[PDB]
């Protein structure tokens, strides 16, 4: 009744939903606490992160820095691969990915520079080629410069600066923190007080208004005690702005309009401590003596309730929710509460490899000087136990264990952690993300599924700026760990592989492990011996893939692994529309090519092992449906490749021309045609047969 | 309450019972104070010494994760629908989200064969995590998602709202160095578990639909926060590995005061925090000199800084200068006015006039390969046009060239163009520059 490709498409749809059901942050960080860690040595194949390269500060910057009379400062523009150094009233930028960079000098400023930041531009203000705005704050004024960071053939942005005539006198309040919103709004704060200012600017000059203005959103008056800021933090997904004070007070501001900023929550350390005391597990790691050293916003795409992470100097991660009083009039929250605490790990870093209650007393992260969190939870902590050498604790969610955990009430914030040592003299200054922000889905459920996006987006990389250089740290995927582990089994027994494989099964489950073997066998992770590793991966896919059984049948883990891998290769395509109507393609052509190559390499792998892989060759009811299921998947693969080739052919011509000379029903059918329908449903095939019959007609008119 | 009877073997009388570990406290006020669940990864479980007339017995509080792990240990040999039975006990008491968060934690090596237990925990996290659904647009995420957010939050709760540093006049780090390492290791363990099970965790791999899609979006967001958390911590550890206060002393005031009230939350998830991190790394790079684009620029500054630190060895000085120029030119298009100015000035001080000029010209040509500036001047410089930017970025280079030539005639004011017949060194630099 139902043909092969339609049967396999059913498996894809159900697999997509399974990946998009990955637990949301609120679900495994429920009210309570956790100390769950599995620590890995930094030199281990199971390390969750590792250093890939380093970039020294240019010698000319050292000449200027040691030529500093009063004040110097370093910072990162990780989004574009640039770093900067300010010396008194002079500023120097450079591309740290370049082996011998030239210094972009800017010395117009008259007074000491106190802060520098790179923010998005205000729309409809600048020429489209201006990609960013450079904000330079001195003790006398704030200066805006246009920036164009266009990519180069080498892979590092070319940076050119533009004057703007946009500037405003600073005033009496120091500026040490500058943050920008998605829409180009610029907010300022510093070490004089807790006030937050905003810089406005517009293209047109008016007789009653200047091109650039500044206002204090805090409207202070009367008696005020000493208190200033330690940082500013933006969350565009909620239109919120957070400030952290030197007294560890957390203030939340809501952008109720394009020019408004309203304080809506103020939560001092006493309030946090009161919440903490009402929790089941209180700890001497968090007292009235403890300082909060950093905040990290959590976007609404990642979690609904948990808005914010706060890091103590003892290494405790405080996760705070925020809630509005009502459900309708963005809606501003009015309350903030400490709900969940992740306590520090216990293992300390060691030169030599050392050998179930809540651990709420570890000092391993004491003192924590700097801290950063990146979605879906990558955590960097600069531990400064000694005044000369920083130690870097880096952890990630145990995505594999979180995904397999059952039932939902057993979910905990499992983590994989490691210690990265920096050499003597390296003082960490800043850590920034160099790759695109992580997101496996568009809502909390499914958002944190690292496994699903292993082959759709490069692993996250992070630039660690120190006083001596920039270190690149890269997140390692399951396939990276699996390939590395197998690389150590090349010179060992049949039982050596089985032992290493069992480690993966106990953490990730059998399907995820066999899917990793399939991926490695197909060359994934090789963008980083390699024939033997891929042959070992093939051996693991065959030997440990399981078999089909009567419970309606239960297909082998080898089959589910093939379906899982294939689904993840096309997850960005399946439910997407093929075209966007001047008609264009929803998916960039370059992305369609890589997807097709991946599908074809998978097909090539199955053909070259049709004789050795169980189920491919024809074979009692169990092995029968195993053969039918595997056959249907392979028919979907070739259909996927044909479908992609058809779309590429289509846009090589002039589709808008073809679309014009077309009937309405076929324009409408093409309007809402998905890749799933093209791959697995007759109407996509019938429509494809119409389009080919139409493109050739047009091709004859061009007559090439 | 949960209770039990402990029998210490007969004939010995209890004398005293005392706390051996640090006093418990989950918060600093009554609300939140007793939340053991929130601190099971921050605090050591409470240990108690029981003194009798024969010895001291040590009694340890067992956490949720400890109970969950050992219970699973009883399900290894046992059945299939025996796990479901054991899990429901936890759900009926702790709730679905707390239960799944515990499974996640045990899957990540938290907890009191251990591999079988971890695999069992993983299995529970998968099979019992629930799914996203829409309410009565709006979606209710799965318990699996809530569990993840819950576990991650509890790992970073001590430092999230904490200031990164403490300042008395140039000094300290709020959270200790060893604790940041453990927090990092814990988070990286979590991340690893997610990747190592990208295929089988529902919502991690790409995808009624709106539900599963927003589930996928929320999980992605959580994972980007983790790597950001890892980077952030890796960055702070790097700070206090170098000479910190040396940077601070040589900073602005807005830069000094932004660092003062910088929280980990801001560093992890807000733009001003990323911007300042960039400022700080930039400072330590242009001091050891005192993305292959952002890396090269640093090495170039390091080369130029070492040149100026020399006794003047034509071989060594010329080499450093020549290489510094080589590197800067490779990243010409990306150089900022501040970095260019400082570089040129340093080259000018070392009598490298030609070199300085060559860099400025190169930078001008790279920030505008379409010659938008030439056409904007050939069109009369119409205001309101957006080539002005392209022209301004070249004018900054041309001005710096003026300074070079100015300083050249200044440095060699009174110097003869010829000595004993042939040209001097001051003359040749004038010709080489022009």
């Amino acid at each position: 009744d139902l043909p092969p490709v339609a049967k396999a498409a059913q498996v894809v749809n159900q697999t997509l939903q399974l990946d998009d059901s990955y637990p949301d942050l609120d679900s495994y960080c429920r009210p309570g606490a956790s100390s769950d860690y599995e620590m890995q040595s930094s030199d281990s194949s199971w390390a969750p992160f590792h250093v890939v390269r380093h970039h020294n500060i240019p010698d000319k910057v050292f000449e200027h820095l040691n030529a500093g009379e009063v004040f110097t400062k370093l910072g990162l523009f990780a989004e574009i691969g640039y770093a900067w150094a300010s010396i008194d009233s002079s500023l120097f930028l450079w591309d740290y990915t370049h082996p011998n960079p030239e210094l972009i000098g800017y010395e117009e400023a008259t007074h000491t520079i106190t802060a520098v930041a790179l923010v998005p531009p205000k729309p409809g203000v600048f020429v489209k080629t201006i990609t960013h705005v450079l904000v330079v704050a001195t003790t006398s004024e704030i200066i805006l410069l246009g920036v164009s960071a266009t990519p180069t053939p080498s892979g590092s942005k070319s940076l050119t600066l533009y004057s703007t005539r946009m500037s405003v006198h600073r005033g009496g309040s120091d500026v040490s923190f500058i943050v920008g919103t998605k829409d180009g709004r610029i907010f300022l704060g510093g070490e004089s007080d807790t006030d937050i200012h905003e810089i406005f600017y517009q293209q047109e000059e008016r007789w009653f208004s200047s091109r650039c203005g500044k206002i204090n959103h805090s409207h202070p008056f009367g008696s005020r005690q000493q208190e200033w800021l330690r940082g500013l933090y933006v969350d565009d997904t909620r239109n919120l702005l957070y400030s952290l004070s030197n007294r560890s007070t957390i203030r939340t501001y809501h952008m109720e309009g394009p020019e408004k900023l309203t304080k809506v929550i103020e939560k001092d350390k006493t309030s946090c401590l009161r919440d903490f005391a009402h929790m089941a597990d209180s700890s001497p790691l968090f007292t009235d003596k403890t300082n909060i050293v950093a905040l990290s916003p959590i976007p609404a795409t990642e979690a609904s309730k948990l808005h914010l992470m706060a890091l103590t100097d003892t290494g405790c991660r405080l996760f705070l929710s925020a809630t509005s009083s009502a459900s309708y009039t963005a809606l501003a929250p009015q309350s903030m509460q400490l709900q969940f605490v992740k306590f520090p790990p216990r293992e300390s870093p060691t030169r030599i490899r050392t050998l179930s209650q809540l651990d709420k007393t570890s000092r391993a992260l004491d003192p924590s000087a700097l801290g950063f969190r990146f979605s879906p939870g990558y955590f960097f902590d600069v531990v400064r136990k000694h005044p000369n050498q920083d130690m870097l604790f880096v952890s990630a969610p145990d995505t594999g264990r979180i995904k397999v955990t059952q039932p939902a009430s057993a979910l905990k914030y499992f983590e994989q952690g490691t210690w990265i040592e920096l050499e003597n003299g390296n003082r960490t200054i800043e850590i920034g993300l160099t790759t695109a922000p992580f997101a496996a889905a568009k809502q909390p459920l499914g958002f944190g599924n690292e496994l699903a996006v292993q082959f759709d987006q490069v692993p996250g990389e992070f630039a660690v700026l120190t006083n001596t250089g920039v270190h690149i740290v890269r997140r390692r995927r399951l396939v990276d760990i699996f390939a590395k582990a197998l690389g150590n089994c090349v010179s060992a027994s049949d039982d050596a592989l089985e032992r290493e494989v069992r480690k993966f099964i106990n953490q990730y489950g059998r399907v995820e492990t066999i899917a990793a073997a399939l991926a490695v066998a197909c060359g994934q992770g090789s963008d980083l011996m390699d024939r033997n590793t891929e042959n070992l991966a093939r051996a693991a896919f065959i030997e440990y893939g399981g078999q089909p059984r009567l419970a309606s049948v239960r297909l082998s883990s080898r089959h589910d692994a093939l379906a899982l891998y294939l689904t993840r290769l096309v997850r960005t395509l399946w439910k997407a529309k093929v075209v966007q109507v001047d008609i264009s393609s929803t998916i960039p052509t370059s992305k369609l090519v890589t997807i097709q190559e991946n599908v074809e390499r998978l097909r090539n792998f199955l053909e070259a092992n049709k004789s050795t892989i169980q189920g491919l060759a024809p074979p009692d009811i169990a092995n029968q449906k195993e053969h039918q299921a595997l056959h249907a998947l392979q028919k979907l693969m070739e259909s996927i490749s044909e479908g992609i080739s058809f779309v590429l052919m289509l846009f090589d011509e002039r589709v808008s021309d073809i679309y014009a000379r077309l009937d309405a029903v076929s324009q409408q059918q093409l309007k809402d045609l998905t890749y799933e329908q093209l791959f697995s449903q007759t109407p996509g095939k019938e429509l494809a047969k119409v389009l080919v019959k139409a493109i050739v007609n047009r091709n004859i008119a061009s007559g090439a | 309450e949960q209770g039990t009877w402990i029998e210490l073997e007969n004939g010995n009388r209890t004398i005293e019972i005392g706390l051996t570990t640090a006093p418990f406290a989950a918060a600093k006020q009554p609300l939140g104070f007793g939340n053991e669940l929130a601190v099971q990864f921050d605090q050591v479980p409470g240990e108690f010494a029981v003194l009798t007339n024969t010895g001291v017995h040590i009694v340890r509080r067992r956490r949720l994760v400890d109970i969950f792990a050992k219970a699973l240990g009883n399900c290894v040999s046992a059945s299939d629908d025996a796990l479901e039975r054991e899990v429901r006990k936890f759900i009926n008491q702790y709730g679905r989200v707390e239960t799944i968060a515990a499974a996640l934690a045990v899957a990540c090596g938290q907890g009191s064969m251990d591999r079988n237990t971890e695999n069992l925990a993983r299995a529970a996290f998968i099979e019992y995590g629930g799914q996203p659904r829409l309410a009565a647009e709006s979606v209710r995420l799965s318990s699996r998602h809530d569990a993840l957010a819950l576990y991650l939050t509890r790992l970073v709760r001590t430092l999230w709202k904490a200031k990164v540093v403490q300042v008395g006049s140039g000094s300290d780090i709020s959270s200790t160095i060893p604790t940041l390492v453990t927090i990092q290791e814990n988070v990286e363990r979590l991340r690893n578990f997610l990747e190592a099970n990208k295929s089988t965790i529902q919502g991690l791999a790409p995808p009624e639909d709106i539900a599963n899609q927003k589930e996928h979006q929320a999980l992605h967001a959580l994972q980007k926060l983790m790597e950001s958390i890892s980077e952030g911590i890796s960055f702070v550890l790097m700070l206090f590995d170098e000479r910190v206060s040396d940077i601070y002393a040589r900073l602005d005031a807005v830069s000094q005061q932004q660092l003062k009230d910088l929280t980990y939350e801001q560093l992890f998830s807000q733009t001003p925090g990323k911007e300042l991190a960039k400022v700080l790394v930039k400072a330590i790079v242009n001091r050891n000199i005192a993305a292959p684009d952002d890396v090269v620029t640093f090495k170039a500054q390091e080369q130029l800084q070492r040149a100026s630190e020399q006794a003047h060895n034509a071989p060594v000085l010329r080499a450093l200068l020549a290489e510094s120029l080589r590197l800067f030119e490779q990243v010409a298009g990306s150089l900022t006015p501040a970095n260019l100015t400082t570089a040129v000035e340093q080259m000018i001080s070392l009598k490298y006039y030609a070199g300085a000029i060559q860099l400025c010209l190169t930078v001008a040509q790279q920030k505008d390969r379409g010659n938008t500036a030439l056409s904007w001047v050939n069109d009369g410089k119409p205001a309101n046009d957006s080539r002005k930017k392209a022209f301004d970025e070249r004018k900054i280079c041309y001005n710096l060239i003026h300074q070079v030539l100015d300083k050249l005639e200044s440095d060699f004011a009174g110097e003869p163009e010829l000595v004993d017949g042939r040209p001097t060194l001051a003359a040749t630099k004038r010709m080489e520059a022009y």
């Binding site: 600048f126 246009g146 600066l161 533009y162 | 002005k388 004018k395 900054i396 710096l400």
Partner: peptide, 14 residues
């Protein structure tokens, strides 16, 4: 080398 600052005319439209 002082960075060449291209003019406002190019920068902002129209």
């Amino acid at each position: 080398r002082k960075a060449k600052l291209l003019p406002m005319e190019e920068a902002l439209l129209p």
